[PDB]
């Protein structure tokens, strides 16, 4: 069994949908056609989802880059071929990207540590195009407006007042949103030959919805099934 | 209510015992005299422990520095005065520090990112002496052998083969153990005027027990009650 | 007139094809339907290309990141909306990617300086998806096999023996090819809201063709015309 | 003979008191019960002190981290087991820590270079607890009020106006005092398995006494004798 | 033949005058006594100059550090013994150093990347004294007033508004002028045992002539002939 | 009075000769024509030397960059115009530069901290040419063979075995010698508009004489008198 996910390599599907909150797994699994509870250890909850004729895991990775890296490494080193993260984010363009808006991200700022412990900082955190394109196409098909851009992946949710946050810098650099895991997923995926992507819903802004969440989940599930079809 | 711990500032005790696994909270709370379940959100589980006439929270912080920082910031900014982490670690001195051995750590290597987003890297991750001294004294009283030293707090649990891990370097520098949160707790505590400490049990070695865990938990609970007495 | 390109903002087309060698501009312009020589100053040669009913500039940017940044900034700050770089590269996967092979790159390693003088190193050098997708589709249409991957953009062509080159590190990290400008183009484009892309032909390997070049040029010209159609 | 201290390894006592000024050695040695002048080379003056039945060296280390490292390395590599630095410092909390106040420090900011040439910057500069506890206890016994905290060890005494000093940053981070050697002593001690500590008297503030110095010296001498007793 | 300069090692003279613009080579070669056109590839134009009885190449290196490094490495690894750069620069002391003024520089700020890929950043970018002295003496002989100082060699000509430029910092540090190649030439020369120097004419200021250019060219040619005499 | 040198600004001569050891001041002052003892505080000993009709201070600066910076800042901010360091060094080219050989250095590697706390690391540590030329000319006049090159100024005299020393790297980069202060003197001098230089005698090699010292001192004194003549 995987040391922390507590599942076997035989239970790892080619496509895996990852989310941060173990509770969101339970909310996702009930909107699939059926499911099989697999394991629940620490913040890592794993369920096998059945959707549109296809099967793919949904696994929670917990909050933050170092914790999610444990999850992602165990999946990538044991059979996963596609990992899509669905999660929440904050808007770095509050005049254009509002609460409830959905963003499909192709790349990320590596404001973590574990990616730098894996490869030099000059290396890009970048998603797989085919995964990005699949998420965009599933949204168009469901007639759900979405934004596209770069996510700032930061290990600091609560800032202090001594070292200035770089969020305003990255906003001026046209980063779209902020969250805490995407860049780690992307680097690990690139290093391990796993195709990755990310779809995120805005729930706040670091500067001065149920319908949207349902839509984002449908997009994420729709894309997982489309990609899973290729590997079946 | 605190955004992620989902408890109120009135429920925050002066002393808090933190652990990584929500399950370990449940294992700890039943060996106290009594307890009050408070909240469970994401990987953050909070319980009020009653032990030796005193009361103190036990809260899980999840795996990894960025995730535990969310927990620690919410406690430090809302009334906590003492935070002791009890957890697991790997031995960096396998000829001297063996599986099951217990280490009480006074300082830590800042191989994370969030501490660096809070204060310059030259700043030390260091625990409070009185907390360190209390944990040592509780162990002596229970006649439980312990080691003392520096912990390497690393955001990388699974290494890759491109960038060498610094664990051997830090072993040669006489670091005792490795784990993934202590340095983050220490810096946040220093910045926020919260006294911190750490007690850890060895469960592996990155290089070439139930009785010990019970002992470590007794030491941690013993020290929490001693410190809580001062604030009551 | 632009200070170094020596053309006017009115002569800047929405789509620009950039190459390193002023001579390659002359080789490209004669395979278009017609052309208009615009300017030639330093290594910056500018020609207006007419191809498949569309018009777009072809401009040389010279060798190396600091020199090409002068070219790219003048285009991005004066009307350019799409910049595609067509150039040469070295294979970082010599068993899979051979001399003459063509690579369409979505992202790049920022081993330059000017990108870091513009934005923090954690920021990704990433291309525009629509541009990447257009280059891939034009190749499929012409039945020309291509590879896709990350380029290492390095300011050091001739290494010395004191500081080890990171090329082997990035090869192990699954970077596909090496060249000297793509990452600079990508960051400048992201900062300036300009869509960028890159198509490259392998002409060597840092470790132990005319038909292919013609094909790569046809792909690059084909994609420029397709994108130019949108802005006309 | 040691290359720069000009004493023999047989003259090295288990406990050594270090100070910056060779003159302070002469002021310290005359308040002991008796003494033996050993050597004086460059700024390194060594005397054997006899106090409360015990013997321990008092050695000057000069101004600044690179110069004191020569002194500390020669002691640690030739028999020293405990090194206590007694010196002066500036207040980083001028509303709380005033001129003449005494601070016993447990850790330090590594704003030097030599510590970084010895071990990675993430490593903590931290003192030995038993040494820290001994200095605190000797002060309580003599009824001498003291403060405890982190020292900023900076290689820059005279700032210029181009690069901002980090002293205000570290003050906001709750560093207590500033001086120029403690962090270097701590890292060298940790690497060499030597127990270190520091006691400092405030003589200024970087921002907007004889009785206290006598008290601080008594505390330092008192602690040296207590520690020396263990090794005799 | 050299890969990019397209000349043979037999055509490399001991002394080489380098300039950025291929056009400036043509302007320089006609004021010599005679010349021999050698090659023109990319931005690298090479001509053999005959002046005051001596012979030395004049070669263009293009804009920017990464591009000029290709030129400089090919010369230094194939016989060159002295390389003098003559070029343009911006004044960092606008009250003292005005448009048209000439500066002979002995050292440079390494705001590039390739020098750092060759040797650690602490290493100085410094010119050869004898070359510096020769340029100064040739100016005195021609009664041409000149300034002397440090050049900032920056890879960023067009700044953006997110990361502050260090030009004001270096101006306060008494750097005289800014340009984009000198530091790269100096480090490569030091590493390869080639004597280097730089003479520059002010053509702007980053903050709030034909006679001078002719004078600067005469100085540069005068110094090349003097140095070439030693090797003939 | 200057805070640490304990002399007045009126006692500061335009030319100052600095050495590390207070004892070397006493050895130097007796070979001048006459002298005036000024002050002795900590490792800072100041004497007014009379030589060949001129007067100039000789001041000891102690061991190491942070300590000598205190000395150099007090001189540069209070009237000094020329500072020459005479000292010892280790050979980084043991096959060419042997024990007793004398090296006159024009630039230095900034392996310190205080220079970096004053100005960004890309800035060169470089000496004044006129000072360098004067030292070379005084040696030629006395028929004393000398070498010229770059010094590595390192804060680490005693290396440990965890982090590799860069001395071999810098030797391969053609650095001539190693010592511990020159780079700090050069940066401080450049920032403060003080002309600096360095002359050094080899007394060891980090890898696998009285007549020479007398010669080096004569050269240093000879150059001080020549420079002092200009300011009198
Ligand atoms: O809300 C998610 C954060 N979700 C996680 C936080 C803890 C568990 C789930 C996005 N987000 C940020 C991510 C990183 C740093 C700062 C922010 C931020 C600021 C304002 C609004 C949203 C923000
Ligand atoms: O076992 C804990 C790790 N516990 C956490 C891991 C995930 C959840 C709980 C200590 N530990 C390490 C911490 C950091 C990096 C490497 C190691 C390591 C290697 C071997 C043995 C123990 C090790
Ligand atoms: O050939 C292009 C380089 N083209 C430019 C070089 C000068 C003008 C045109 C790709 N390339 C590299 C780019 C960067 C660093 C190293 C290499 C490299 C090594 C071997 C083979 C190809 C290589
Ligand atoms: O006074 C000691 C400094 N003692 C040494 C200085 C030279 C010899 C002895 C503490 N101190 C500082 C140490 C570091 C950097 C700045 C300061 C500082 C500023 C104001 C007041 C005190 C200060
Ligand atoms: O003009 C040369 C630049 N020449 C080159 C530029 C492109 C081809 C030739 C000096 N220069 C700068 C060099 C670096 C960065 C900024 C500046 C700058 C700013 C104002 C005035 C002059 C300046
Ligand atoms: O001897 C002087 C050092 N003098 C000072 C040392 C303490 C007081 C005086 C040159 N030197 C080095 C300077 C820096 C780092 C390493 C070395 C080194 C190694 C071997 C031989 C000479 C060496
Ligand atoms: Na977590
Ligand atoms: Na983390
Ligand atoms: Na160029
Ligand atoms: Na460049
Ligand atoms: Na000193
Ligand atoms: Na120092």
Residue numbers in the entry:
A (entry chain A), B (entry chain A), C (entry chain A), D (entry chain A), E (entry chain A), F (entry chain A): 4 to 211, 222 to 245
Wording from the paper:
Purines are obtained by the parasite from the host erythrocyte mostly via hypoxanthine, the major purine base salvaged by Plasmodium, through metabolizing adenosine via the sequential action of adenosine deaminase and purine nucleoside phosphorylase (PfPNP). PfPNP catalyzes the phosphorylation of inosine and guanosine to ribose-1 phosphate and hypoxanthine or guanine, respectively. Since hypoxanthine synthesized through this purine salvage pathway constitutes a major source of purines for the parasite, PfPNP is essential for parasite survival. Like in previously reported structures, PfPNP forms a homo-hexamer, with three 2-fold symmetrical dimers arranged around a crystallographic three-fold symmetry axis running through the central aperture of the assembly.
The MMV000848 inhibitor (MW = 308.4 Da, 1-carbazol-9-yl-3-cyclopentylamino-propan-2-ol) is composed of one heterocyclic carbazole aromatic group of three fused rings connected to a cyclopentyl-amino five-carbon ring by a propane moiety that comprises a hydroxyl group at position 2. The latter forms a hydrogen bond with Asp206, and several water-mediated contacts with Ser91, Asp206 and the hydroxyl group of Tyr160. Thus, the conserved active site residue Asp206 appears key for the stabilization of MMV00848 in the active site pocket. Although It does not form direct contacts with MMV000848, the bound phosphate ion plays a key role in stabilizing the complex: it forms hydrogen bonds with Ser91 and Arg88, bifurcated hydrogen bonds with Arg45′ from the other monomer (residues form the monomer partner in the dimer are labeled with a prime) and a water-mediated hydrogen bond with Glu184. A conspicuous difference is observed in the active site loop that joins residues Trp212 to Val222 of the enzyme. While this loop is ordered in the complex with transition state analogs such as ImmH where it folds into helix ɑ8, here it is disordered in the complex with MMV000848.
